[PDB]
Amino acid sequence: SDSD
Amino acid sequence: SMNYFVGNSLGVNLTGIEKAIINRLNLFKEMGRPAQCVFLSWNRYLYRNAQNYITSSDYINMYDFFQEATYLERNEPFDWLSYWTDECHYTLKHVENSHDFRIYDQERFLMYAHFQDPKYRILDYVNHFDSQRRKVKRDFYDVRGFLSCSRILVDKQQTLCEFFYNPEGDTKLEKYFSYKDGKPEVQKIIVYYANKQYFFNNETELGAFFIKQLYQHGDLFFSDRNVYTAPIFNLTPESIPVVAVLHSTHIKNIDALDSSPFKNVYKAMFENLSRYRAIIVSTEQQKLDVEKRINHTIPVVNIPVGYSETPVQTLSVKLISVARYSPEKQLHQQIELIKRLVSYVPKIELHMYGFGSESKKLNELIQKYGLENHVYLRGFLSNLDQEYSDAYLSLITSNMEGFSLALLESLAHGVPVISYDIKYGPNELITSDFNGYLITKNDEDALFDKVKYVIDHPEVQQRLSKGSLAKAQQYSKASLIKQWDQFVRLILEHHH
Ligand SMILES: O=c1ccn([C@@H]2O[C@H](COP(=O)(O)OP(=O)(O)O)[C@@H](O)[C@H]2O)c(=O)[nH]1
């Protein structure tokens, strides 16, 4: 959720 | 006097059109005419993907141009890790199984950073978070090192707007988005150029502006990715000369020459034909059909998309097929052919180079027919120059084709060919009884008989192979140079  | 070949980008794996654009550039380099590749899309990796094929002076990217990053190259690498630690006093936490870091101001989570390499010398992106861990902005770094674009997020990480920066950090372009079918669609563009602001509604209007800024009197433009480049030139004045290059069949149904609609990708060009000085196709056969379809309203010219340039014919009996594993190519038939032939020629083998959806089905028919030591799905191969030296014959059993660089190369290696007589490509590279044979589409029995005949007649295969060497030589670098120079000379004087 914090990486893409 | 500059010649612009306008495609869209360059990927890690070059497409046909990207190959064709680079090859045309190389010829124009030799010939001595100024050429550059024009790319349109935003691709912060373009400089890496390009490096193995062209130079920074050899292309202008639209977004690089307005970001004042045209011709720029790689920065000295920058230790982001030590900047964040030693200079910023942030707290870094490596994520395992990745090139990633969470970046903290003590307890506070600030940022998530993706590095491309495992040596963390290529910062790729950095996500920023607010006090509720909501992801508010994404910073996208060009491979050359600068921060290329920031993207502002709303709701469920939806793209609201983007800002594009020159390498010193000034904002040079703005873009605003609204979602449609689950995806962001551009609704506005602002561009800071020439100490002014310019406004646009979409990326076709910006490209048209881009084109105008490059154009000096005497330049010549080539529309090569017509789904995008054709709507752009259609919004630029007729005083700017532009040639449409088609890189595939021009109509949805080759079997209804007069009436089939044009392909979707070529619709906008064909509906505004008087905008363009000419159309270039890769085969004489397709030149003749397009000329008749448009009623000669503008010139059509065939210029091949590729050119010809190791021991050859070192002859078991090796059949080959260089073709994507797709429906069109009808590769099962080549298995069927081998099924019948092995009983008469059991030292035969058929190597199928390429890849695609139909691999599983093709592996099965091999097993079914017990040909596992006769038909090999050899996958995709980075160079085939060794594979051609001992190929007896090549086979094409497709129902639709285009001009084949692969076929052209195989004919430079002396490999004759037997092919269905379908459009386009086969008839360009294959003169019956000179370098191969042309068979009626889907006549698996004439296919067998002609394939059988050449195997039973090595001296025929010699003639055909010598004919393939002769065929290839008509596509020489210098032949292509001469066509291209002539075409550019003639196009520009008519536009006087
Ligand atoms: O397994 C393969 C298949 C294709 N090619 C290369 O792909 C280029 C284009 O061939 P073709 O036009 O047949 O490819 P397509 O456009 O049909 O995918 C040629 O130079 C081939 O040598 C290759 O190196 N290995």
At B426, which CATH number? 3.40.50.2000
Helix axes B203-214, B226-233, angle to 10 degrees: 70
Of the candidates B94, B90, B82, the one whose C-alpha atom is nearest the C-alpha of residue B109 is B90
User: Cα separation of B329 and B393, whole Å?
Assistant: 17
H/E element, B487 = helix B477-494
Of the candidates B366, B374, B367, B315, the one whose C-alpha atom is nearest the C-alpha of residue B348 is B374
What residues of A are in contact with residue B157 (Cβ under 8 Å)?
A: 4
State the CB neighbour count (10 A cutoff) for residue B171. 13
Tokens of B141: 């770094």
Helix axes B332-342, B444-455, angle to 10 degrees: 50
Instruction: Evaluate whether B2 touches B34 at the Cβ level (below 8 Å).
Output: yes
Instruction: Evaluate whether B103 touches B114 at the Cβ level (below 8 Å).
Output: no
Torsion of CA B46, B47, B52, B53, to 10 degrees: 70
Of the candidates B128, B139, B140, the one whose C-alpha atom is nearest the C-alpha of residue B104 is B128
Nearest to A3 among B109, B112, B133 (CB): B112
User: Cα separation of B146 and B144, whole Å?
Assistant: 6
Instruction: Evaluate whether B297 touches B274 at the Cβ level (below 8 Å).
Output: yes
H/E element, B452 = helix B444-455
Of the candidates B144, B98, B484, the one whose C-alpha atom is nearest the C-alpha of residue B282 is B484
Say how many Å lie between the CA of residue B214 and the centre of ligand 1: 34
Give the end-to-end CA distance of chain B in Å, rounded to a whole number.
Answer: 13
CA distances from residue B120 to B75, B105, B306 in whole angstroms, order as listed: 15, 20, 40
- Neighbour-count burial of B290, counting CB atoms closer than 10 A to its CB (0-12 exposed, 13-18 middle, 19+ buried): buried
Of the candidates B315, B322, B318, the one whose C-alpha atom is nearest the C-alpha of residue B451 is B318
Measured in degrees and rounded to the nearest 5, phi and psi for residue B113 equal -115, 125
Give the end-to-end CA distance of chain A in Å, rounded to a whole number.
Answer: 7
Contact A4 B95 (CB under 8 A): no
User: Cα separation of B374 and B261, whole Å?
Assistant: 43
Which residues contact residue B294 at a Cβ distance below 8 angstroms, ignoring those fewer than 6 apart?
Answer: B270, B273, B279, B300
Resolution (A): 2.3
State the CB neighbour count (10 A cutoff) for residue B73. 11
Contact A2 B133 (CB under 8 A): yes
CA distances from residue B357 to B15, B200, B331, B335, B354 in whole angstroms, order as listed: 18, 41, 12, 17, 11
Tokens of B348: 């035969």
Tokens of B476: 């020489």
Q: What is the Cα B386 distance to its own chain's centre? A: 25
What's the order of all strands across the beta sheet hosting B158-165? B91-95, B100-105, B108-115, B123-129, B135-141, B147-154, B158-165, B171-180, B183-193, B196-200
User: % helix / strand / coil in chain B, to the nearest 5?
Assistant: 30, 25, 40
Which residues contact residue B383 at a Cβ distance below 8 angstroms, ignoring those fewer than 6 apart?
Answer: none
User: Cα separation of B210 and B63, whole Å?
Assistant: 9
What's the order of all strands across the beta sheet hosting B279-281? B59-61, B35-39, B3-6, B220-223, B242-245, B279-281, B300-302
CA distances from residue B273 to B6, B300, B324 in whole angstroms, order as listed: 18, 11, 33
Of the candidates B200, B209, B247, the one whose C-alpha atom is nearest the C-alpha of residue B225 is B247
CA distances from residue B127 to B44, B111, B146, B177, B228 in whole angstroms, order as listed: 17, 5, 16, 19, 31
Q: DSSP 3-state assignment of B408?
A: helix
- Structure determined via: X-ray
Measured in degrees and rounded to the nearest 5, phi and psi for residue B81 equal -60, -45
Q: DSSP 3-state assignment of B35?
A: strand
Amino acid letter, B461: Q
| Residues B254-260: contacts with CB under 8 Å, at least 24 apart | B254/B400, B254/B423, B257/B289, B257/B292, B257/B293, B258/B292, B258/B293
Largest Cα–Cα distance in chain B? 82
* Among chain B residues, CA nearest to A2: B112
User: Cα separation of B217 and B374, whole Å?
Assistant: 60
The count of residues in chain B is 496
Largest Cα–Cα distance in chain A? 7
| Residues B143-147: contacts with CB under 8 Å, at least 24 apart | B143/B44, B143/B45, B143/B47, B143/B48, B143/B74, B143/B116, B144/B47, B144/B69, B144/B72, B144/B73, B144/B74, B144/B75, B145/B74, B145/B75, B145/B77, B145/B78, B146/B69, B146/B75
User: Cα separation of B22 and B25, whole Å?
Assistant: 5
The count of residues in chain A is 4
Say how many Å lie between the CA of residue B240 and the centre of ligand 1: 35
Q: What is the Cα B251 distance to its own chain's centre? A: 20
Instruction: Evaluate whether B151 touches B162 at the Cβ level (below 8 Å).
Output: yes
Amino acid letter, B449: D
Tokens of B216: 């000096």
Amino acid letter, B353: Y
Strand partners, B60: B38
- Neighbour-count burial of B445, counting CB atoms closer than 10 A to its CB (0-12 exposed, 13-18 middle, 19+ buried): exposed
Instruction: Evaluate whether B123 touches B141 at the Cβ level (below 8 Å).
Output: yes
Q: Within 13 Å of residue B111, how many CA atoms lie on the same side as its CB? A: 18
User: Cα separation of B344 and B254, whole Å?
Assistant: 37
**How close A4 comes to chain B (CA, Å)?**
8
Instruction: Evaluate whether B306 touches B475 at the Cβ level (below 8 Å).
Output: yes
Nearest to A3 among B100, B109, B133 (CB): B100
Contact A2 B138 (CB under 8 A): no
Contact B125 A4 (CB under 8 A): yes
- Neighbour-count burial of B291, counting CB atoms closer than 10 A to its CB (0-12 exposed, 13-18 middle, 19+ buried): middle
Look up the domain containing B434 and give its range: 317-474
Q: Which atom of ligand 1 is nearest to the CA of B379?
A: 1
Torsion of CA B320, B434, B398, B314, to 10 degrees: 10
Tokens of B307: 């050119």
Strand partners, B109: B104
User: Cα separation of B396 and B420, whole Å?
Assistant: 6
What's the order of all strands across the beta sheet hosting B317-322? B375-379, B348-353, B317-322, B393-396, B417-420, B436-439
Instruction: Evaluate whether B7 touches B225 at the Cβ level (below 8 Å).
Output: yes
Tokens of B24: 């045309």
State the CB neighbour count (10 A cutoff) for residue B190. 16
Which residues contact residue B146 at a Cβ distance below 8 angstroms, ignoring those fewer than 6 apart?
Answer: B69, B75, B165, B166, B167
Of the candidates B372, B368, B366, B395, the one whose C-alpha atom is nearest the C-alpha of residue B455 is B395
- DSSP assigned state of B300: E
Instruction: Evaluate whether B110 touches B126 at the Cβ level (below 8 Å).
Output: no
User: Cα separation of B229 and B39, whole Å?
Assistant: 10
Of the candidates B386, B425, B383, B423, the one whose C-alpha atom is nearest the C-alpha of residue B403 is B425
Instruction: Evaluate whether B206 touches B193 at the Cβ level (below 8 Å).
Output: no
Dihedral of CA B24/B29/B35/B39: which sign? positive
Report, in angstroms and rounded to the nearest whole number, the Rg of chain A calculated over CA atoms: 3
User: Cα separation of B443 and B203, whole Å?
Assistant: 48
What residues of A are in contact with residue B109 (Cβ under 8 Å)?
A: 2
